[PDB]
Design a binder for this molecule. Structure first.
Ligand SMILES: C=C1NC(=O)[C@@H](CC)NC(=O)CNC(=O)[C@H](Cc2c[nH]c3cccc(OC)c23)NC(=O)[C@H](Cc2c[nH]c3ccccc23)NC(=O)c2csc(n2)[C@@H](C)NC(=O)CN(C)C1=O
Ligand SMILES: Nc1nc2c(ncn2[C@@H]2O[C@H](COP(=O)(O)OP(=O)(O)O)[C@@H](O)[C@H]2O)c(=O)[nH]1
Ligand SMILES: [Mg+2]
Ligand SMILES: [Mg+2]
Ligand SMILES: [Mg+2]
Ligand SMILES: [Mg+2]
Ligand SMILES: [Mg+2]
Ligand SMILES: [Mg+2]
Ligand SMILES: [Mg+2]
Ligand SMILES: [Mg+2]
Ligand SMILES: [Mg+2]
Ligand SMILES: [Mg+2]
Ligand SMILES: [Mg+2]
Ligand SMILES: [Mg+2]
Ligand SMILES: [Mg+2]
Ligand SMILES: [Mg+2]
Ligand SMILES: [Mg+2]
Ligand SMILES: [Mg+2]
Ligand SMILES: [Mg+2]
Ligand SMILES: [Mg+2]
Ligand SMILES: [Mg+2]
Ligand SMILES: [Mg+2]
Ligand SMILES: [Mg+2]
Ligand SMILES: [Mg+2]
Ligand SMILES: [Mg+2]
Ligand SMILES: [Mg+2]
Ligand SMILES: [Mg+2]
Lengths: 205, 675, 86
RNA sequence: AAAUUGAAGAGUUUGAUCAUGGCUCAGAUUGAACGCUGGCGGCAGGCCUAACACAUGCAAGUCGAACGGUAACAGGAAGAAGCUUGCUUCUUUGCUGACGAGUGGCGGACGGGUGAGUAAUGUCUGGGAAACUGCCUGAUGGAGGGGGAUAACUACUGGAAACGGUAGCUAAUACCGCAUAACGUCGCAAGACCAAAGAGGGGGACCUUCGGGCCUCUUGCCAUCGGAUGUGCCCAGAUGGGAUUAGCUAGUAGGUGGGGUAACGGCUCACCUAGGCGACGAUCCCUAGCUGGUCUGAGAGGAUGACCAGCCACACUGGAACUGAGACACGGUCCAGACUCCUACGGGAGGCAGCAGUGGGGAAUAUUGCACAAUGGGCGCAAGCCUGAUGCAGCCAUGCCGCGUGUAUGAAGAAGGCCUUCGGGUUGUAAAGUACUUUCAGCGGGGAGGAAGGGAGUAAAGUUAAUACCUUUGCUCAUUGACGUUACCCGCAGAAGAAGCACCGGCUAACUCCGUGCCAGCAGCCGCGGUAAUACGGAGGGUGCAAGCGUUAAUCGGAAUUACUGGGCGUAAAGCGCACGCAGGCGGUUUGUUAAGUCAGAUGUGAAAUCCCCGGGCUCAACCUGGGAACUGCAUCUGAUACUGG
């Protein structure tokens, strides 16, 4: 129910940095981005309309580490909610604990976030949770366990948090390794390289 | 929970004897004895003994089928049961079947004790049988007891070791076990026998020999212990006597089993491969702590209790609801309503302690010869050899409708008995079946019409033939032409035909492209070959697959526009026709080498029968235990040979068949098949 | 009967059946007396027969043999036929 | 404030095109099955076939506070004491607790199962009149006084068993008279007639028939009028297909009169009349339990009725009645029939479509489990007993849901594999190595919630005559958990126990090499294979999904391809050869009236669950749950009169 194979094959297939690696090194030096994985990764064949829609969907799923069944439930939830389906779907994907832990920087990537959340090392409002896809309500407080406070990996990710651009809606206190969820993003803070419109008509065939 | 089982006290015994030797009769009495004492179907029973001094031992009794066709059934019980009580008829003495059954047990090193029976029948002498046993089985049998009286005069038996001419009451079979003085006329014989028993017991223990040398009158208990030691070591064949019909001697052999015949703990532990990949000999000891291990056998059925599966617990203690991996099938199944049988009635049991035999209701994957090991797949157990079938007859469903039922029925039969095996004939699609014995096939068909309600007539298996040319026929001409309106196809061919020696070509056919030059464009060479091949399979003389035929194409003609692969293919077939006719072929029968082992005294009988079946012998082997003969008896002629062979060898012979070579059929036989 | 209480109820039902049949015929025969008097046409005989049976139907209706509606309707249309006679 | 904010196309007829038209595909779904593979937990589901046959165990008992009574256990005591440092009171008694069997009361008509029958005598929707109703509830009054019998029991006797028979004795809230007779029944009145039962707790004075009466509390009984609940009956509409089924009907349709039913009624009989149904489909034939709902669809609609809830019908087959408030009765009776079993051969016994299970059938569906602790039911004053309902556990990836199978670092990119224009590329930061982490599994310990109540004591109040008994309210104490070694929490050790399936010619995401050579084979459609096959088989690479993945079956969709929404008929399929004409469908124009259609308002219904919206609780989720919306369908009442109809 997870991905265990090579990480940068995913970043290669959609041809862009997917943040799967910690970013301590340059992704270009670590791997050749402009080539697709496999023996034919030299060739770039003409991709059809269905192909580009599928690549967009698979790109979002591999950024957030979510499988297809989970992701289809998010889309149905997004379509049921009032508003607009595209940014509603993105909003749920943000409220997952993996993303919020990762974005606040206690984990270098979602995989550290996954270990941290799933190894009972994350508390929300002081309650221990180990479910990766637990939605985060606004005004909820996520903090590190006192046992987990003395581990090297968590403090290591705090520096990389600064190394990248800080999220405006998450307020962090690395002095005691805590963070606050003020409210959800509005799709204006998120990266524009994700075309959420293609997602709607992929699942609405 | 607690085992609550008197370990070592319980014994496992098997009754084996020649056909009509009284085995079933005495077993019935045995059950009566143990039942009143408290107050190959598995029958457990707590036997305390005739004098009941011994704490009630849980004796398990599993009679065996005397008939030769059911050797496997006897074999199954023999391995499963550590001790075996042989039965020998007083008047008949040792008989072929008894000799036969003894050797398999020797192979398994299973300790044995024998009980002479039918003493009441006029014309019987226990001492004569003892002599017969030692000569036939080559094993010294110390007489545990000496029969007093014969036929009508026969009144009882005097224990040799204990020196008491026990005389059971006429009123009831076993109420009184009173011990009396040896009859005056018998004491003299009893005396010599007692000394003989004392020396024999002494050598077995060796220490006892030292006291015997000094002349000390060895205490009866000490010598008795030495006797059991040798029994575990499996040398002395202890023998007791009595008449089951007269209700005398059955109880005596039961007590002997308790105090001499070894217990499951006594018998050496089983072995096997811990893992399938490597031999890994582990020799799991008979311990409840050791992971549970058992072997399934004699799967059966009950219309209201379901399938019945018999398992021998060697080590461990399985409990209800415990998944159990079948090593041979590599899959695990859960034990449900484990049930044991107390003969008179069936009693449910949640779990079975080690050393006891019960039944597992509803165990679908449990079948004959299944290693029911623990889920962790511990050491698998050795697998019991299975003898091949000797007689094979073709059974045909009475109606096409029956076919469906017929196939399913035979399949289930194979499960209960591995030896019984069925298969469909590749040609003529005949349901040829084979069984361990003629009587076995008879019983199979009988129960098929009853339990499965399927009537099927039995007829001899039909034989397939080759049919091949004899003399080389060269320069055969075959021309094909289809010159007609639209599109004509022409393709002429000229080939030669020469018989191939069987050894020369394994395939039996050849197609050298001798064609000097491009006499054929080359695109039609495969086509020509294909045409012959179809004809090769379809025998012109009598529809049989021609073998040992050598043809090489050398000349051919074609029409510039009408040249067609199909034309040459058909033309090739044409050439085959004329060539085959002029070569006057001869049908070939499956002459097969046959090796027959038989007793020396019956060598002549065997030779005559082999010769009679148009089989020319090629060798004689003078093996110590009988002569080994070899012959290429025609398969078509050899049908029912197993049954015929037994009568000429007093049911003491066997044969292994292996196809040798297809040879020319004699004029009469060949013509019969042609017509 | 496989249930112990089922056997008991069988026995009591037979006993109550016999008792009820006797009582029901005993009542029913009195209605027959008055009906026969009606077709005989003697009003005095009919009234005598009627006031013999009148407590009987009411007693049976009260004790549980029949319904008080059944007792009422029997006695109701009997008086109707008596009054039509005279 | 929120309560559907909802519709996609592609391949294939041709040398090419347009159209028509079928076939196929992309989606969702399932009580699924099979193949390959498989770690965990949560919740749910699990014989669709043979309404086929059934071994065995259990599934409906309870009441001593109705009665006789003592078979059984314990208590109690007359007495030689069965006995001796009296350990013990072994012959006796209902005297006590309590209770086998028996009479009696209630329950057994509930709960549980199955879908054979049933096209409407059932179901759904909305009404209605001629009814009954145990237990529960409100009120008004009675509850007086007698009789005979019968089990059980005792004796005798028959039988293998099932089980009886003969005679004698004994009760009762068992049964039966007499008294009583009103707001009850009949009648119009006058009048006539109809019932009942005692038992238990406690006690002051008195009287003793030294048994008790007696006094009060509770509970039970009888009558009548109500309430509620349940059921019986009636009507209209709706609820499948076939005209290659056109006539059907003789208690048939109606009336009078008698009988019958709790009640109306040809319900039944006698007589009288000749009617009744039917083209708006009677009759006959096939199929079928109906609904809320479920699946799909943008909607209309199409399919469907497994789980959950309502109703109906059945209980081996056919029929019948009895008891009862209620049955024509799953674990009751009687008869007949098919089948099976026991036997001493004289006769008897049985009914898993209850739970579990076996055989059989089948592609296919589970344990011969635990506990009444919770909720519910039956009995009982309660305590308690019973409960295969139910609560749980076991088995199965059968669904949905969640998690894990690690985490960073890591190079000229090791080895090997593969391609190679021999230069290199690719697997691939992937691995190894470095550091880190311990979720779930395992081992050890700790430990919620489902628990409300019931029991003993005491205080207070009622209450009487009262301090008594009994009830109501607190207070003190000792206890009540199948699941359960519970969820959950903590400690431990180590990456250690955990990834497979399908596909890669186009439709459709993803390409090369080797084998093979129209062969082997593949294939949903077009089709591929006869020496460079991206289509077969293998291998590297990739893609999709993931503890699952595929295939098959089945439903809807796409299919506007039965077109009501929403299609066509000159030539693609399709205008009767033509006309007349009954039923039917439709109808010019003006005024009046009616208010049937139509429209508006209101009222009552449209069960709950489900679907949808806003919330709440399992750590999330599935799941559970509060409210709302919805169910705009039916019926009634009031109103409007433009259009349709009269
Ligand atoms: C070579 C051939 N392949 C086989 O026979 C395949 C078919 C499964 N079985 C075997 O090789 C193995 N044995 C089997 O499995 C069975 C059982 C068996 C196992 N070992 C045995 C030893 C002794 C007797 C046995 O049996 C009691 C057996 N026993 C048969 O089958 C028999 C005998 C036989 C024919 N051959 C054999 C080669 C070796 C051993 C036995 C044979 N059969 C006919 O009596 C018969 C008469 S006519 C006819 N069959 C038709 C079918 N045509 C032919 O025989 C022509 N032909 C040459 C072959 O068929
Ligand atoms: N006279 C006599 N006959 C015996 C005795 N034991 C067995 N038999 C007979 O032997 C016959 C077969 O006995 P059985 O047990 O069935 O032997 P099985 O056929 O091998 O199983 C029976 O008819 C018995 O009457 C015996 O001790 N004396
Ligand atoms: Mg999942
Ligand atoms: Mg036998
Ligand atoms: Mg003989
Ligand atoms: Mg069924
Ligand atoms: Mg039905
Ligand atoms: Mg009474
Ligand atoms: Mg009176
Ligand atoms: Mg009275
Ligand atoms: Mg009438
Ligand atoms: Mg049906
Ligand atoms: Mg549509
Ligand atoms: Mg009645
Ligand atoms: Mg019943
Ligand atoms: Mg039943
Ligand atoms: Mg069942
Ligand atoms: Mg089957
Ligand atoms: Mg019971
Ligand atoms: Mg449609
Ligand atoms: Mg059209
Ligand atoms: Mg035409
Ligand atoms: Mg036309
Ligand atoms: Mg025309
Ligand atoms: Mg008009
Ligand atoms: Mg109107
Ligand atoms: Mg509703």
């Amino acid at each position: 129910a997870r991905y265990l194979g090579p990480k940068l094959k995913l970043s290669r297939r959609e041809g862009t940095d997917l943040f799967l690696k910690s970013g301590v090194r340059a992704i270009d030096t670590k791997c050749k981005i402009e080539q697709a994985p496999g023996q034919h990764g030299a060739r770039k064949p003409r991709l059809s309309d269905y192909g580009v829609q599928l690549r967009e969907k698979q790109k979002v799923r591999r950024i957030y580490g979510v499988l297809e069944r989970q992701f289809r439930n998010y889309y149905k939830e997004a379509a049921r909610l009032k508003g607009n389906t595209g940014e509603n779907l993105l909003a749920l994907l943000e409220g997952r604990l993996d993303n919020v832990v990762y974005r606040m920087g206690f984990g270098a990537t979602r995989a550290e976030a996954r270990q941290l959340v799933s190894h009972k090392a994350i508390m929300v409002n002081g309650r221990v949770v180990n479910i990766a896809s637990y939605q985060v309500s606004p005004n909820d407080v996520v903090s590190i366990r006192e046992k987990a406070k003395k581990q090297s990996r968590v403090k290591a990710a705090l520096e990389l948090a600064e190394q990248r651009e800080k999220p405006t809606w998450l307020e962090v206190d690395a002095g005691k390794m805590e963070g606050t969820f003020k409210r959800k993003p509005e799709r204006s803070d998120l990266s524009a390289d994700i075309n959420e419109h293609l997602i709607v008509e992929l699942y609405s065939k | 929970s607690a085992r609550t089982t008197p370990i070592a006290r319980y014994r496992n015994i098997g009754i084996s004897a020649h056909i009509d030797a009284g085995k079933t009769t005495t077993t019935e009495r045995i059950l009566f004895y143990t039942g009143v004492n408290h107050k190959s179907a598995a029958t457990t029973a707590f036997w305390s003994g005739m004098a009941k001094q011994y704490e009630p031992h849980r004796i398990n009794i599993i009679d065996t089928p005397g008939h030769v066709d059911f050797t496997i059934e006897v074999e199954r019980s023999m391995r499963v049961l550590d001790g075996a009580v042989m039965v020998y008829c007083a008047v008949g003495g040792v008989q072929p079947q008894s000799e036969t059954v003894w050797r398999q047990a020797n192979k398994y090193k299973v300790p044995r004790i024998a009980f002479v029976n039918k003493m009441d029948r006029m014309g019987a002498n226990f001492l004569k049988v003892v002599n017969q046993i030692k000569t036939r089985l080559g094993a010294n049998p110390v007489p545990l007891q000496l029969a007093i009286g014969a036929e009508e005069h026969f009144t009882g038996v005097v224990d040799l070791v204990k020196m008491k001419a026990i005389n059971w009451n006429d009123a009831d079979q076993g109420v009184t076990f009173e011990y009396e003085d040896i009859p005056a006329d018998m004491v003299e014989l009893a005396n010599e026998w007692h000394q003989n028993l004392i020396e024999s017991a002494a050598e077995a223990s060796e220490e006892l020999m030292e006291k015997t040398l000094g002349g000390e009158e060895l205490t009866e208990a000490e010598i008795k212990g030495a006797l059991r030691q040798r029994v575990l070591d499996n040398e002395i064949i202890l023998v007791t006597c009595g008449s089951a019909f007269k209700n005398k001697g059955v109880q005596a052999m039961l007590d002997a089993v308790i105090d001499y015949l070894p217990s499951p703990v006594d018998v050496p532990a089983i072995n096997g491969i811990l893992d399938d990949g490597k031999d890994t000999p582990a020799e799991r000891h008979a311990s409840d702590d050791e992971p549970f291990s058992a072997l399934a056998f004699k799967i059966a059925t009950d219309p209201f209790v379901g399938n019945l599966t018999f398992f021998r617990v060697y080590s461990g203690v399985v409990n209800s609801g415990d998944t159990v991996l079948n090593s041979v099938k590599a899959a695990r199944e859960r034990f449900g309503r484990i049930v044991q049988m107390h003969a008179n009635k069936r009693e449910e049991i949640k779990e079975v302690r080690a050393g006891d035999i019960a039944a597992a209701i509803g165990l679908k994957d449990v079948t004959t010869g299944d290693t029911l090991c623990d889920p962790d797949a511990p050491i698998i157990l050795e697998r019991m050899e299975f003898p091949e079938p000797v007689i094979s007859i073709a059974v045909e469903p009475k109606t096409k409708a029956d076919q469906e039922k017929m196939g399913l029925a035979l399949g289930r039969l194979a499960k209960e008995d591995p030896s019984f095996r069925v298969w469909t004939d590749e040609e003529s699609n005949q349901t040829i079946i084979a069984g361990m014995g003629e009587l076995h096939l008879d019983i199979i068909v009988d129960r098929m019409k009853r339990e499965f309600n399927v009537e099927a007539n039995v007829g001899k298996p039909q034989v397939a033939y080759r049919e091949t040319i004899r003399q080389k026929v060269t320069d055969v001409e075959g021309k094909h032409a289809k010159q007609s309106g639209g599109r004509g196809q022409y393709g002429h061919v000229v080939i030669d035909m020469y018989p191939l020696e069987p050894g020369s070509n394994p395939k039996g056919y050849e197609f050298i492209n001798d064609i000097k030059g491009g006499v054929i464009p080359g695109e039609y060479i495969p086509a020509v070959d294909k045409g012959i091949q179809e004809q090769l399979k379809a025998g012109p003389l009598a529809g049989y697959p021609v073998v040992d035929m050598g043809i090489r194409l050398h000349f051919g003609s074609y029409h510039d526009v009408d040249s067609s692969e199909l034309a040459f293919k058909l033309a090739a077939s044409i050439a085959f026709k004329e060539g085959f006719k002029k070569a006057k072929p001869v049908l070939l029968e499956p002459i097969m080498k046959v090796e027959v082992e038989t007793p020396e005294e019956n060598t002549g009988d065997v030779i005559g029968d082999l010769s009679r079946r148009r089989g020319m012998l090629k060798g004689q082997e003078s093996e110590v235990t009988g002569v080994k003969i070899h012959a290429e008896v025609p398969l078509s002629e050899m049908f029912g040979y197993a049954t015929q062979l037994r009568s000429l060898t007093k049911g003491r012979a066997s044969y292994t068949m292996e196809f040798l070579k297809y040879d020319e059929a004699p004029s009469n036989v060949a013509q019969a098949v042609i017509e | 009967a496989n249930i112990k209480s089922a056997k008991k109820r069988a026995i009591q039902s037979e006993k109550a059946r016999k008792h009820n049949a006797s009582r029901r015929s005993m009542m029913r025969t009195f209605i027959k007396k008055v009906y026969a008097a009606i077709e005989a046409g003697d009003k005095a005989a009919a009234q005598k027969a009627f006031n013999e049976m009148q407590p009987i139907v009411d007693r049976q209706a009260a004790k549980g043999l029949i319904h008080k509606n059944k007792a009422a309707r029997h006695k109701a249309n009997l008086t109707a036929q008596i009054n039509k006679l005279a």
